[PDB]
């Protein structure tokens, strides 16, 4: 399938998915190509937060969509 998302750096990759891989595979070809990390990354779909163990088929996104990837971070 297909979903391109854009970096803290002003970056965005294309990439290819498929409804029955899982967020978490795929969150890790990326981390290989870019270096994101993926426990410090968060995939965003209209609002709603990505978990690594839910399949792509199941938050309805179809082909070509966007996501956003957020860092998260305390510190105390």
Known sequence: MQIFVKTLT??????????????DNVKSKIQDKEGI????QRLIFAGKQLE????????????ESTLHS???????
């Open 37 to 40: 990390p993926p426990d410090q």
């Open 70 to 76: 957020v860092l998260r971070l305390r510190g105390g």
């Open 10 to 23: 002003g970056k965005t990759i294309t990439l290819e998915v498929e409804s029955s891989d899982t967020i």
């Open 52 to 63: 690594d163990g839910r399949t792509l088929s199941d938050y309805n996104i179809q082909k």
